[PDB]
Symmetry: C2
Subunit: 340 residues, 2 copies
Amino acid sequence: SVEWKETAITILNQQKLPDETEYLELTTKEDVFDAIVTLKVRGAPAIGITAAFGLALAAKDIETDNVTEFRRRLEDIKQYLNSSRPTAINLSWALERLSHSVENAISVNEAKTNLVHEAIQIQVEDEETCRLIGQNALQLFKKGDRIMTICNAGSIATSRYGTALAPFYLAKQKDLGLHIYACETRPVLQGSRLTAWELMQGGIDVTLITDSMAAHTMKEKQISAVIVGADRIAKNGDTANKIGTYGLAILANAFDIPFFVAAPLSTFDTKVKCGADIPIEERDPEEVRQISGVRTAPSNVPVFNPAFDITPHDLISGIITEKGIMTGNYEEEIEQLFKG
Amino acid sequence: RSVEWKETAITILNQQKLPDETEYLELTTKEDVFDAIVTLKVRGAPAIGITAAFGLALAAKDIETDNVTEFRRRLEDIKQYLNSSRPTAINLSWALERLSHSVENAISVNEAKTNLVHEAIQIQVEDEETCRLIGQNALQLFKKGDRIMTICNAGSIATSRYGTALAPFYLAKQKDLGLHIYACETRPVLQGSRLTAWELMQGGIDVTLITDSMAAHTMKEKQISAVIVGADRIAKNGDTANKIGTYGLAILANAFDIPFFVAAPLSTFDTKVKCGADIPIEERDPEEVRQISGVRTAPSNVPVFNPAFDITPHDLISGIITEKGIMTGNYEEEIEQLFKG
């Protein structure tokens, strides 16, 4: 979904799926700003990745020889791409990675080839963390069980395999007759437009359901467990995910059904105490008032449009990263985990 | 108005056209009634019955028979034809069962042929008064300036007028009390963002739209004070069957500890069952979950699960509101010591 050409970045326009597989050639630091706010590219990690190739690109365009000045401008761009979308850290996390990869550059020309290797490197280890999460999480389910998910934490949300979908892809070979239930994550339908398309495009047993049906499906389909990705995880353990995730957790807990949050180490924010202090992005009201040019509610009806909710660690049965499975006491587990 | 009986035609508002359009239709055939109902041009537990009833009567028109028992004899074929439209709502059953019972001791084909129309009008108006009564009955449950959340569209176009769950809001507007209602779009058919948001707006009712996937978060962030929905069929023990999505609002509600309320006219009841788990949950066309108003949202061919209703077990309901009053505890007996007559 994200591919780098030292001249530009070609991204799969995620808005179009499942209808068309369009590719756009982002070449300007503003073409990237837009690709993000506009959701042409989404998924905490994939988003972090393009953010990086963004600075990595707008930088060659930077003219001069003063390393100190170069880094002044570089910072304005970083604050710009970062102002794009909040709630997930993967964005500013990848940005930091880069603006530090040049805290001791002697020249500029190097610092420019520096940023790129970093960005190209951030993307390489994304395949690695995902393959791991796919493999660490699969330990949780067995042959036969039907698992639910939300949003689209798959191949195009990351680099490959994904986080919460990763195990499905793996359970496939193993021939684990895993039956998935994906919810059409409204309003942006990242679930019916991406998660159904992808999993089907790979021969996984998916079944699409509206967000509402969540509970009825849990009862009459005997859901076995729930796994979702993340956008930001606090020291506390509280996790920030697609609007709707919280409801499934509290709803899942009622059915005493396992709630898993699959997410990379880069999705954690050690600086933040709990979830309640994680800024939730509210997007354009029209995301709820119309779709593909067709109005679905009174044009001026007031709307509450939050993109993410928070799931208190009290609701999480386990957390999966490239390191393993911290099934509880996520406060401490993380301080241990975190190091370097 | 919702459903209008002429003496040779039923005029329904095409609800699948809203919110951008308000077109009406001239139903003439029992074929036309069957369609409208099944394709949701007309929906809402009561409105449905109002139509099935009227429709049946318009049917019993173009049917020649000197005989009374020959008229009745084949007069089910119609009842059955329509009753086989949509399963879940117990109002379509109830509303046909009534019409077929009020011609039992009919002495002439023209008598019944004419009693039916009177019966179907008896039913519509009765509803208005019972919607007006539930409205008042339920308004006692909310203080002023509180945030209520609903699902589906149990209002005036779903009923003859006033509604059941929405009733209390029109009335609150009257007594002027700061009610802010939160309507979840209610997918797949979207009667929430399309029907509810649109009428409450007309009536200057303070409304805010949210996708179904925002129940929980809105509950915490917005501090919603209560929840109110409206059945399609209630079981002899409190177990209510309402539009898909209600069961979770119930579970969530319980979790946030806020009152969950059901508003249903007496007819929306079905004492002849022991619980909801035994209530026929309709399942509609898959392409309903695969798109949004013509716009394909998912890859066609993607397997879909599409139940139209779910079941909220009585011990999750903080109270049921009827035209006769409120019930707060043992529903099984209360429900029993009511249909007593």
